[PDB]
Design a protein around this nucleic acid. Structure first.
Ligand SMILES: [Zn+2]
Lengths: 710, 198, 116, 48
RNA sequence: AAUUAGCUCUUGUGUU
């Protein structure tokens, strides 16, 4: 977030221009280490901020280029370097934290515990943590059949291009149940729906054959055309583009009384609001029409029963927003408000014709105080209308025991409203294997809606999809704009981040090449996930952030890529420079996400499930590292957890966060409220191997006591 | 007769808006976009909107473009009754006065001397001051010795005094204030003010 | 006709014969656009004080006197366009009224204000 | 409203004043009014 | 003898 997203937001904001005018362009943000001042700048230690109720934040500086242009060509590009904008709090132990890469001796000299995991902010001297919020994945077509409405099926598709100030737009294509099967479209920003044929005509495809080509790719099984026939029929009066534009604009949020206003309104909402991810450029109908036709095709396939409906609880369809995306969400609106305030000040000050000093125009209070408030109270949004958005995103860190602190930093929150009669989101889905602990969850009213990451689970940070695009295009991939629609049927579709791009003829070699590239981590980073569906010729490639994945050992035919050489080199580590990253670069382990897990074959253990016995599968592709990695932090301290009843494991996961014990080594300097600490904590006589990495042998909570059951 | 419309305007800056529209028309009748607005009316006490006489609402929307004061009324305008037009042009309407501004708002002042210059009138008031003790107040008798002991900005002429705020006092402030800063009709003091000053 | 427009909002006054709103400074510097041929406002200050007063109510930004009912109501249909006062309380001097009556102009008060 | 109708009696701003008075009186005894703006102070929170 | 509203977390009921 700090490295890339702030710069991306500040450059993405449109230039502010307004009796001459100015330019006032922003670029090249500068960020420094946190400092505190009738004083001079000087660094603040996190302990000092925690003790003095300060805010562990750092100033932000941006480069401004102002150019006043008037008659006679008298313009000067005056550049203000490193102008103060506001303070941003810093996650502890980050790249811009003062406690970055320091040895344990330095941390002890700074009264900072070397065992402190970091990963939390300090607002007003209080430790705040961000719960990772899950949501439905964007830029993807989802079909759910609802029995509570008139819609037999509905192909919902949420969309957002890239961290844009425009709120995400949803496309609904719904088929009525009941002639019959009136397929209609619910255009966003429009109060009323509209039949799909009208929209397709509005895009500029008067040729009916072209419309069915974009809807149907086959012409010898007439079921898709049988169902689209009535839908073709209701839109029988509309043939020209202009009348379709009028029909659409007659239902807009500002319905123009005159015909030309309706045409302009409908054209703008079609070319700027509908399907932003595929493109909102000068013209993109050549691919927007194909994407809409693909959505209609999936809806028809769902109606035909040829493809089962998507599952809302399948974690391949969910994305986890961490601190980064949430802070970007705040910063977008915050920068917009700052720009609005500066524009208003300029408007007031230029009517008199005088030249304004932009140093007085920029208010630090808009960026710093708003961010501080939203991160402190947890109300994630504008302070004036915070109740509209969610609450409890930012919570107080729980320094009761070390296990509780660790479990509070790896927490996932479902935004499903509480006190809801629904029970399906609360259940433990099958896809939550190796991704979320199956035993650690609150037992209160939020049971099943608050979860914890597994031990080996990782969350994708995201990457730019362009290099994949160039590598794919330089192969036999044929772009969507120059392919005959007759070739779509006997080929496989290609999707990148949900955007339908191009087409391919030989998918096996393509998948092998992409897998080899990801193993060699040359062009395809390890976070990218590639899936290929067999029944439906589709290949989906995902690079966006928020996808949850886990490492897995790779099997070529029946034996692991891992051999005694790797184990030896990894045993003498911290003497040589062999590490986990080197194990990844060798192509022995691979990060598999929950969507790609659907199309793989796991072996529980190498020796037991890969030798020669009665032939069960014999075609394994991946092997689990260790099965006991499916548990979370709190659940992995239970000895022999597979001998207990599952609710007992849940209760132990809950009560492990209440156990008295030494919650941190430097408890003598922290002026925390409600600190409990035991005199004689003891290392458990019987332990799991997993709790070796939880530092439980270094900060235990409990005593070994001679218990008699009588 | 052309219709009349309400166009929302910023409160407190209604007078300048009519002048701005008139200047726009005078600047633009020669141009290719003359203002097809007929007239602009601003009542003395009606705030928040301005009357616009024009044939149609489209004329109003075209004419009020680019004016900051009429942004709220730029999109939407309301139907004014015809039978209201007349009432639009109907406007209704040793002494004692009360000041309007300053720290002496709604305070009784006895008109001592009426200066013939018709700029300021001399008025007798009860000091609403704290004698510069807390600030760095009710009506109470003027204490000359207190303000002489506290010192500060003070000049003494026996029973006359000049102190902070360019305030003149004698025996009771005797200060000049404009007739536009006081109300010369409808004070009607009671017997308590007579003692103080069916 | 930008000459009729007042340059500011200080010490504005209304003509007792035309309801013309103008600053006293512009009354001395320029004078009434319709009483110049009858009273010659330009070149003096005391006669301007006598002819025009600063007590006025309401402002009307008139620009189309030939296509407006307000001009007909306010008897300013035939006068030059400009900002006009709604109701003005006051009376012209007896000598000035007699001179205007002699020069073929009938003095009609602009006091349309309601007296209780 | 009383001071405006005492002298002004504009008969048009009177309609707005009585509408606003109706809105405030209604919100004083029922805040969650269907399809109407909520009565909020300078805090973003609806009143009680 | 010194206030309130909101939010968050947590405790008991999870038995056959
Ligand atoms: Zn005149």
């Amino acid at each position: 977030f700090i490295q890339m997203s702030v710069q991306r937001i500040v450059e993405d904001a449109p230039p502010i221009d307004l009796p001459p005018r100015y330019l006032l362009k922003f670029e090249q943000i500068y960020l420094s280490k946190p400092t505190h001042w009738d004083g001079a700048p000087s660094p603040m230690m996190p302990n000092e901020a925690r003790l003095r109720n300060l805010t562990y934040s750092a100033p932000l500086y941006v480069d401004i280029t102002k150019t006043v242009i008037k008659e006679g060509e008298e313009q000067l590009q005056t550049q203000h370097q490193k102008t103060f904008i506001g303070k941003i709090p810093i996650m502890l132990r980050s790249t811009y934290c003062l406690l970055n890469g320091l040895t344990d001796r330095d941390l002890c000299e700074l009264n900072e515990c070397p065992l402190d995991p970091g990963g939390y902010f300090i607002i007003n001297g209080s430790e705040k943590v961000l719960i990772a919020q899950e949501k439905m994945a964007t830029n993807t077509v989802y079909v759910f059949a609802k029995k509570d409405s008139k819609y037999a099926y509905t192909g919902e598709c949420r969309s957002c291009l890239e961290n844009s100030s425009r709120p995400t737009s949803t496309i609904w294509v719904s088929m009525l149940a009941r002639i019959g099967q009136r397929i209609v479209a619910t255009l966003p920003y429009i109060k009323q729906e509209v039949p799909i044929i009208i929209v397709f005509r509005a895009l500029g495809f008067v040729s009916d054959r072209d419309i069915l080509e974009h809807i149907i790719y086959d012409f010898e099984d007439p079921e898709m055309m049988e169902m689209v026939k009535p839908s073709l029929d209701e839109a029988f009066v509309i043939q020209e583009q202009n009348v379709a534009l009028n029909f659409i604009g007659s239902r807009g949020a500002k319905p123009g009384v005159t015909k030309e206003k309706r045409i302009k309104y409908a054209k703008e909402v079609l070319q700027k609001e509908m399907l932003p991810h595929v493109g909102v450029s000068d013209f993109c109908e050549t691919k927007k029409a194909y994407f809409l036709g693909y959505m209609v095709h999936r809806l028809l396939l769902a109606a035909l029963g040829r493809r089962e409906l998507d599952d809302r609880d399948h974690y391949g369809n969910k994305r986890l927003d961490l601190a980064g995306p949430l802070l970007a969400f705040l910063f977008r609106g915050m920068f917009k408000n700052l720009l609005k305030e500066v524009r208003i000040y300029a408007q007031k000050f230029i009517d008199r014709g005088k030249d304004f000093n932009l140093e007085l125009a920029i208010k630090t209070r808009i960026i710093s105080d708003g961010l501080k408030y939203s991160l402190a109270t947890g109300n994630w949004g504008d302070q004036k209308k915070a109740h509209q958005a969610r609450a409890g995103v930012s919570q107080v860190l729980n320094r009761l025991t070390f296990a509780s602190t660790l479990s509070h930093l790896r927490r996932l929150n479902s935004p499903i409203g509480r006190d809801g009669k629904l029970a399906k989101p609360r259940q433990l889905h099958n896809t939550l294997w190796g991704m979320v602990c199956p035993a650690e969850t609150p037992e209160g009213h939020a049971v099943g809606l608050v979860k914890n990451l597994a031990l080996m689970a990782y969350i994708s940070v995201g990457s730019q999809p362009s290099p994949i695009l160039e590598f794919l295009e330089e192969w036999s991939m044929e772009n969507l704009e120059e392919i005959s629609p007759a070739a779509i049927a006997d080929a496989t579709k290609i999707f990148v981040n949900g955007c339908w791009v191009g087409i391919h003829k030989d998918p096996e070699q393509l998948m092998n090449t992409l897998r080899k590239l990801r193993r060699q981590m040359d062009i395809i980073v390890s976070e990218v996930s590639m899936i290929r569906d067999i029944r439906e010729r589709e290949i989906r490639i995902y690079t966006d952030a928020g996808r949850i994945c886990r490492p897995l050992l790779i099997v070529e035919k029946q034996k692991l890529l891992l051999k005694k050489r790797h184990i030896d080199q990894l045993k003498e580590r911290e003497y040589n420079n062999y590490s986990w990253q080197d194990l990844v670069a060798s192509g022995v382990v691979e990060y598999i996400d929950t969507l790609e897990e659907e199309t793989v074959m796991l072996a529980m253990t190498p020796d037991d499930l890969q030798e020669k016995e009665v032939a069960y599968c014999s075609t394994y592709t991946h092997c689990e590292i260790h099965p006991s990695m499916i548990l979370g932090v709190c659940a992995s301290i239970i000895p022999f957890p597979d001998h207990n009843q599952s609710p007992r494991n849940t209760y132990q996961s809950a009560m492990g966060k209440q156990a008295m014990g030494v919650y941190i080594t430097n408890f003598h300097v922290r002026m925390d409220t409600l600190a409990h600490v035991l005199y004689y904590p003891q290392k458990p006589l019987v332990t799991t191997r997993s709790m070796e990495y939880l530092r439980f042998r270094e900060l235990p909570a409990g005593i070994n006591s001679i218990v008699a059951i009588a | 007769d052309p219709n009349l419309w309400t166009v929302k305007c910023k409160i407190g800056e209604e007078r300048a808006t009519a002048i701005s529209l008139m200047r726009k028309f005078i600047a633009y009748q020669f141009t290719d976009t003359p203002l097809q607005i007929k007239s602009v009316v601003a009542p003395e006490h009606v705030k928040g909107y301005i009357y616009v006489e024009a044939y149609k609402q489209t004329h109003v929307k075209q004419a009020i473009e680019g004016v900051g004061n009429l942004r709220l009324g730029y999109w939407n305008q309301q139907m004014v009754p015809i039978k209201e037009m007349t009432d639009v042009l109907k406007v209704v309407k040793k002494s004692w006065v009360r000041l309007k501004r300053g720290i002496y708002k709604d305070d009784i002042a006895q008109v001592d001397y009426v200066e013939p210059s018709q700029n300021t009138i001399s008025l007798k008031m009860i000091p609403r001051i704290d004698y510069d003790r807390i600030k760095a107040p009710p009506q109470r008798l003027f204490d000359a010795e207190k303000i002489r002991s506290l010192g500060g900005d003070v000049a003494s002429d026996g029973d006359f005094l000049i102190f902070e705020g360019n305030r003149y006092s004698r025996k009771f402030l005797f200060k000049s204030f404009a007739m536009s800063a006081v109300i010369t009709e409808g004070v009607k003091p009671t017997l308590s003010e007579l003692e103080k000053f069916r | 006709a930008l000459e009729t427009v007042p340059k500011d909002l200080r010490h504005l006054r209304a003509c007792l014969l035309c309801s013309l709103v103008k600053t006293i400074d512009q009354f001395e510097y320029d004078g009434c656009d319709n009483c110049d041929a009858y009273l010659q406002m330009k070149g003096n200050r005391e006669m301007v004080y006598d002819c025009t007063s600063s007590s006025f109510d309401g402002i009307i930004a008139m620009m189309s006197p030939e296509d407006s009912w307000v001009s007909k109501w306010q008897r300013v249909s035939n006068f030059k366009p400009g900002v006009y006062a709604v109701s003005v309380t006051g009376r012209l001097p007896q000598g000035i009224v007699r001179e205007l009556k002699s020069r073929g102009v009938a003095y009609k008060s602009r006091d349309t204000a309601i007296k209780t | 409203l009383r001071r405006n109708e005492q002298n002004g009696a504009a008969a048009h701003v009177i309609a707005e004043d009585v509408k606003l008075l109706q809105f405030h009186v209604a919100t004083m005894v029922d805040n969650e009014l269907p399809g109407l703006p909520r009565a909020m102070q300078k805090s973003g929170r609806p009143l009680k």
